[PDB]
Enzyme design. Structure first.
Site, PDB file in Angstrom:
ATOM      1  CB  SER A   1     -31.503 -17.964 -56.288  1.00 10.11           C
ATOM      2  OG  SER A   1     -31.694 -18.812 -57.310  1.00 10.11           O
TER       3      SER A   1
ATOM      4  CD  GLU B   1     -27.958 -14.652 -62.447  1.00 11.41           C
ATOM      5  OE1 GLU B   1     -28.109 -15.688 -61.795  1.00 11.41           O
ATOM      6  OE2 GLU B   1     -27.983 -13.505 -62.003  1.00 11.41           O
TER       7      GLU B   1
ATOM      8  CG  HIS C   1     -27.558 -18.731 -60.069  1.00  9.18           C
ATOM      9  ND1 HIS C   1     -28.673 -17.704 -60.116  1.00  9.18           N
ATOM     10  CD2 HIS C   1     -27.883 -19.281 -58.990  1.00  9.18           C
ATOM     11  CE1 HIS C   1     -29.520 -17.967 -59.211  1.00  9.18           C
ATOM     12  NE2 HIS C   1     -29.165 -19.021 -58.539  1.00  9.18           N
TER      13      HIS C   1
HETATM   14  C1  LIG Z   1     -26.981 -20.160 -55.981  1.00 12.44           C
HETATM   15  N1  LIG Z   1     -26.991 -21.135 -54.811  1.00 12.44           N
HETATM   16  C2  LIG Z   1     -28.367 -21.717 -54.625  1.00 12.44           C
HETATM   17  C3  LIG Z   1     -26.411 -22.419 -55.289  1.00 12.44           C
HETATM   18  C4  LIG Z   1     -26.652 -23.766 -54.653  1.00 12.44           C
HETATM   19  N2  LIG Z   1     -26.778 -24.867 -55.831  1.00 12.44           N
HETATM   20  C5  LIG Z   1     -27.794 -24.651 -57.002  1.00 12.44           C
HETATM   21  O1  LIG Z   1     -28.246 -23.399 -56.848  1.00 12.44           O
HETATM   22  C6  LIG Z   1     -28.286 -25.528 -58.258  1.00 12.44           C
HETATM   23  C7  LIG Z   1     -28.725 -26.738 -57.810  1.00 12.44           C
HETATM   24  C8  LIG Z   1     -28.982 -27.950 -58.694  1.00 12.44           C
HETATM   25  C9  LIG Z   1     -28.791 -27.508 -59.934  1.00 12.44           C
HETATM   26  C10 LIG Z   1     -29.383 -28.735 -60.602  1.00 12.44           C
HETATM   27  N3  LIG Z   1     -29.876 -29.578 -59.678  1.00 12.44           N
HETATM   28  N4  LIG Z   1     -29.506 -29.135 -58.455  1.00 12.44           N
HETATM   29  C11 LIG Z   1     -30.201 -29.984 -57.331  1.00 12.44           C
HETATM   30  C12 LIG Z   1     -30.172 -29.323 -56.057  1.00 12.44           C
HETATM   31  C13 LIG Z   1     -31.986 -29.171 -55.723  1.00 12.44           C
HETATM   32  C14 LIG Z   1     -32.702 -30.302 -55.455  1.00 12.44           C
HETATM   33  C15 LIG Z   1     -31.847 -31.450 -54.511  1.00 12.44           C
HETATM   34  C16 LIG Z   1     -30.316 -31.459 -54.956  1.00 12.44           C
HETATM   35  C17 LIG Z   1     -29.727 -30.110 -54.910  1.00 12.44           C
HETATM   36  C18 LIG Z   1     -28.350 -26.298 -60.314  1.00 12.44           C
HETATM   37  C19 LIG Z   1     -27.866 -25.401 -59.396  1.00 12.44           C
HETATM   38  C20 LIG Z   1     -27.218 -24.083 -59.860  1.00 12.44           C
HETATM   39  C21 LIG Z   1     -25.796 -24.059 -59.626  1.00 12.44           C
HETATM   40  C22 LIG Z   1     -24.791 -24.913 -58.942  1.00 12.44           C
HETATM   41  C23 LIG Z   1     -23.948 -24.879 -58.549  1.00 12.44           C
HETATM   42  C24 LIG Z   1     -23.157 -23.490 -58.384  1.00 12.44           C
HETATM   43  F1  LIG Z   1     -22.057 -23.199 -57.964  1.00 12.44           F
HETATM   44  C25 LIG Z   1     -23.902 -22.270 -58.610  1.00 12.44           C
HETATM   45  C26 LIG Z   1     -25.232 -22.529 -59.084  1.00 12.44           C
HETATM   46  F2  LIG Z   1     -26.073 -21.658 -59.541  1.00 12.44           F
END
Ligand SMILES: CN(C)CCNC(=O)c1cc2c(cnn2CC2CCCCC2)cc1Cc1ccc(F)cc1F
Ligand SMILES: *[C@@H]1O[C@H](CO[C@@H]2O[C@@H](C)[C@@H](O)[C@@H](O)[C@@H]2O)[C@@H](O[C@@H]2O[C@H](CO)[C@@H](O)[C@H](O)[C@H]2NC(C)=O)[C@H](O)[C@H]1NC(C)=O
Ligand SMILES: *[C@@H]1O[C@H](CO[C@@H]2O[C@@H](C)[C@@H](O)[C@@H](O)[C@@H]2O)[C@@H](O[C@@H]2O[C@H](CO)[C@@H](O)[C@H](O)[C@H]2NC(C)=O)[C@H](O)[C@H]1NC(C)=O
Ligand SMILES: *[C@@H]1O[C@H](CO[C@@H]2O[C@@H](C)[C@@H](O)[C@@H](O)[C@@H]2O)[C@@H](O)[C@H](O)[C@H]1NC(C)=O
Ligand SMILES: *[C@@H]1O[C@H](CO[C@@H]2O[C@@H](C)[C@@H](O)[C@@H](O)[C@@H]2O)[C@@H](O)[C@H](O)[C@H]1NC(C)=O
Ligand SMILES: *[C@@H]1O[C@H](CO)[C@@H](O)[C@H](O)[C@H]1NC(C)=O
Ligand SMILES: *[C@@H]1O[C@H](CO)[C@@H](O)[C@H](O)[C@H]1NC(C)=O
Length: 527
Positions: free
Chosen positions: A196, A323, A436
């Site tokens: 990512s 994704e 994702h």
């Molecule tokens: C791939 N790793 C990186 C997964 C880690 N989390 C995310 O990527 C994620 C984060 C998201 C959002 C929407 N708002 N925020 C807030 C964040 C950023 C700013 C401060 C608060 C936290 C969406 C997703 C996507 C997501 C969530 C859970 C998961 F199981 C797999 C995923 F793809």
């Protein structure tokens, strides 16, 4: 007892039993002066030696960052939140060497993801001890600064130039060049890999000249720099910087006085105001990310790519089947991780406004047009599956394919994969599919642990992925030569062949998401 002498001091490792073998872990090696006090927002300053034996036996502090609070208690989202203390003092890295000490081993360097706002190298799913054990590569990972503390930018101004988190990484890559030989690693055989924002970070090291000589090859999992969330414009970066200066009272008129002001605010005050620096927001909103700073990046990277100005080497690039699904429960109306999230055309249309807030009414109509020519109108999950594909094709799949196309055009070998296996353990609902971020445990050989509830078929799939990744890292060719595996073709902008990863048949297919990506890559950019 094992003690390596680095250029900056001695470090004591620790011993890890893996698979009836032994791996040596060095966790929490400092790789820069702590960016504290007057060093906040500035580039990472070089490190003064120590006389002692740094006991790199425990994961260091994670970097300051807001935490995803959307699912308290739920391991599906909580497995991604930092699992050591947050602290501005967080510039540290980790080393897993195989034991017995290797002689001249390929080094794998992991850059985590997390929207450039979050992440830490100490996650359980980033544990390098398996790869060291099974393939006798050295795994290195580092923590770099995230959010405003790592990507605030007032252009030209060394008090806050931008891309500090990227420079954090680059100082870690250089630590590995100067020091990994003492660990039994070959600095001439270093493969960056990431996921990512990590993956997008890897692509920016291909473009940045100061990284050119810090690595050999590159692996981009579900991310690249040309992704729509990846690079912030110099305009927005200033608006976002100044808007943050208002929200904290730190709005001055001398730019440096503004920075001076933010350095005396509390990390929690900066963390708490980052969210509002954008006027509208999406779940894919990188509030403080990479910018064109004229130091790490010399020009708009979409130009550097287009005109061949990047490190010439082999890339391995891939994406996951779904994704886009994870993002739908962070805002989309009618969605939930806890029901089947069937939705309607009207709910679908409303979620477009959620995921494309600044886009004209006609832009939103065009997305509806290109994703609702239902082959079969009877299916009720039509609009639910459409929105996941919208977000995944626009934010991840299409930019990866476009990057691999463009990068291969200058003559380098490129290999593309399509990860389509849904973890037998996966704690999210089934309507979310191959999510994702959920190839990473397979890439890190966690299913190789038979005492972990993964199926045996998953054990093999991880075993093969770990072989393919390591062969790519050592020999620039990601084949599994022994077990009569499906051979992995090079990606050519003409024929565009990719490899599907799955537990059943690993097949060779062509021109992934061709219809969807012509839209996202040629039409939609113009609206
Ligand atoms: C791939 N790793 C990186 C997964 C880690 N989390 C995310 O990527 C994620 C984060 C998201 C959002 C929407 N708002 N925020 C807030 C964040 C950023 C700013 C401060 C608060 C936290 C969406 C997703 C996507 C997501 C969530 C859970 C998961 F199981 C797999 C995923 F793809
Ligand atoms: C540049 O910034 C201004 C200011 O944004 C406002 O203040 C911030 C601290 C934050 O809280 C934002 O949400 C605020 O809106 C933006 O102008 C604003 O635009 C929004 C759009 O909805 C509007 O509601 C506000 O009233 C506007 N406020 C002011 C003072 O102009 C402006 O759009 C930003 N530019 C870009 C390109 O994003
Ligand atoms: C699926 O659930 C969403 C989310 O709502 C929450 O989760 C459910 C499992 C249950 O606990 C709900 O009562 C919770 O509030 C539902 O979306 C809501 O839908 C209603 C009516 O459709 C609407 O008033 C709310 O604003 C919606 N809230 C959100 C956050 O989306 C949705 O209706 C459920 N759909 C199906 C098909 O089961
Ligand atoms: C660093 O560690 C030193 C030795 O560690 C101890 O002895 C070895 C043999 C292992 O059993 C290890 O787990 C033990 O903790 C300490 O003597 C020294 O004080 C430590 N220095 C620190 C913590 O600053
Ligand atoms: C380590 O090896 C160096 C050169 O070999 C490197 O490794 C192979 C796998 C290829 O990636 C190749 O391109 C590399 O150059 C030597 O120059 C070096 O001295 C060796 N050092 C020791 C201590 O063995
Ligand atoms: C802004 O403040 C700094 C700190 O004193 C000073 O060195 C710098 O020259 C100032 N610039 C202007 C334009 O006033
Ligand atoms: C090849 O197959 C054997 C079993 O015949 C297995 O134990 C081994 O780990 C496999 N290696 C791979 C898939 O890389």
């Amino acid at each position: 007892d094992i003690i390596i002498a680095t250029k900056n001091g001695k470090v004591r490792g620790m011993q890890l039993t893996v698979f009836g073998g032994t791996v040596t872990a060095f966790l929490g090696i400092p790789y820069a002066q702590p960016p504290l006090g007057r060093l906040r927002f500035k580039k990472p300053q070089s490190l003064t030696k120590w006389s002692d034996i740094w006991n790199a036996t425990k994961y260091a502090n994670s970097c300051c960052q807001n935490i995803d609070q959307s699912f308290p208690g739920f391991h599906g989202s909580e497995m991604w939140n930092p699992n050591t203390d947050l602290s501005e003092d967080c510039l540290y890295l980790n080393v897993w060497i195989p034991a017995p000490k290797p002689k001249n081993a390929t080094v794998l360097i992991w850059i985590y993801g997390g929207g450039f706002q979050t992440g830490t190298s100490s996650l359980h799913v980033y544990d390098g001890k398996f790869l060291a054990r099974v393939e006798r590569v050295i795994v290195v990972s580092m923590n770099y600064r995230v959010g405003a503390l790592g990507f605030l930018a007032l252009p030209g101004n060394p008090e806050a130039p931008g891309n500090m988190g990227l420079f954090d990484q680059q100082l870690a890559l250089q630590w590995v060049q100067k020091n990994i030989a003492a660990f039994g690693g070959n600095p001439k055989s270093v493969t960056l890999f990431g996921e990512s924002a990590g993956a997008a970070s890897v692509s920016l090291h291909l473009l940045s000249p100061g990284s050119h000589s810090l690595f050999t090859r590159a692996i981009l999992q579900s991310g690249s720099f040309n992704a729509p969330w990846a690079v912030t414009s110099l305009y927005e970066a200033r608006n976002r910087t100044l808007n943050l200066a208002k929200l904290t009272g730190c709005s001055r008129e001398n730019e440096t006085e503004i920075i001076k002001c933010l350095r005396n605010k509390d990390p929690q005050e900066i963390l708490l105001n980052e969210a509002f620096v954008v006027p509208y927001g999406t779940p894919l909103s990188v509030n403080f990310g990479p910018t064109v700073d004229g130091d790490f990046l010399t020009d708009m990277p979409d130009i550097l790519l287009e005109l061949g100005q990047f490190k010439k080497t082999q890339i391995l690039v891939g994406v996951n089947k779904d994704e886009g699904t994870a993002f739908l429960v962070y805002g989309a109306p009618g969605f939930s991780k806890d029901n089947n999230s069937i939705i309607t055309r009207k709910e679908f249309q409303e979620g477009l406004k959620i995921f494309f807030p600044g886009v004209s009414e006609f832009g939103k109509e065009s997305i509806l047009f290109h994703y609702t020519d239902w082959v079969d109108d009877q299916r009720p999950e039509n609009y639910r599956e459409a929105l996941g594909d919208v977000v995944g094709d626009y934010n991840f799949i299409c930019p990866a394919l476009e990057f691999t196309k463009k990068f291969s055009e200058w003559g380098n070998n490129a290999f593309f994969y399509y990860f389509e296996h849904r973890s037998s353990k996966l704690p999210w609902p089934e309507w979310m599919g191959v999510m994702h971020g959920y190839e990473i445990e397979f890439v890190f050989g966690l299913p190789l642990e038979r005492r972990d509830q993964y199926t045996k078929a998953e054990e093999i799939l991880s075993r093969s992925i770990v072989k393919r990744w390591a062969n790519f890292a050592k020999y620039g060719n990601p084949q599994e030569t022994q077990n009569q595996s499906t051979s992995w073709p090079v990606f050519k902008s003409t024929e565009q062949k990719y490899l599907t990863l799955n537990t059943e048949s690993t097949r060779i297919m062509t021109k992934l998401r061709a219809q969807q990506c012509r839209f996202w890559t040629s039409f939609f950019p113009k609206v």
